[PDB]
């Protein structure tokens, strides 16, 4: 069945996957595109000299390790699998609380 093939593909992708290594670890830098959907700018405080904003923060990159050619459809996965993948260590310098 289709779900069986998807499960097999995901297990093949994540077995032998080193999360400690970025994509192209010993090679050229990985390009990460960013885009943001701003949903709120809530409190602009002169007392605290800060502002609060809520956003949808999306990062896109390529990881040849996570490539698959059996299933022809895009795969939306349960978000917990993020813990088992490499993600860029993006931070905000002027951030006080998030």
């Amino acid at each position: 069945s289709n779900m069986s093939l998807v499960k097999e593909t995901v297990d093949r992708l994540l077995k032998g996957y080193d999360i400690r290594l970025r994509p192209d670890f010993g090679g050229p830098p990985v390009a990460v595109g960013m885009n943001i959907d701003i949903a709120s700018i809530d409190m602009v405080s002169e007392v605290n000299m800060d502002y609060t904003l809520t956003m949808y923060f999306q990062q896109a990159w390529r990881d040849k390790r996570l490539s698959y050619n059996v299933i022809p459809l895009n795969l939306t996965l349960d978000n917990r699998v993020a813990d088992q993948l490499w993600v860029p260590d993006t931070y905000f310098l002027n951030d006080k609380k998030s």
């Binding site: 289709n2 779900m3 998807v6 499960k7 995901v10 809530d42 409190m43 299933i71 459809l73 939306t76 996965l77 349960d78 917990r80 699998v81």
Partner: protein, 51 residues
């Protein structure tokens, strides 16, 4: 001691289960029926424009 029977049902249910794939991933849409019971509608803050 009928707890072992239910234990076996429970461990057989998850046998081969993949909680990373929505049910019907390649076949159909997953329909989620939702309802809400408001136990209390809290205070409103017109200053923060929130409730």
């Amino acid at each position: 001691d009928n707890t072992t029977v239910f234990t076996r049902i429970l461990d057989r249910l998850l046998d081969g289960y993949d909680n990373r794939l929505r049910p019907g991933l390649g076949e159909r849409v997953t329909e989620v029926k939702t309802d809400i019971f408001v136990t209390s509608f809290g205070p409103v803050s017109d200053h923060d424009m929130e409730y």
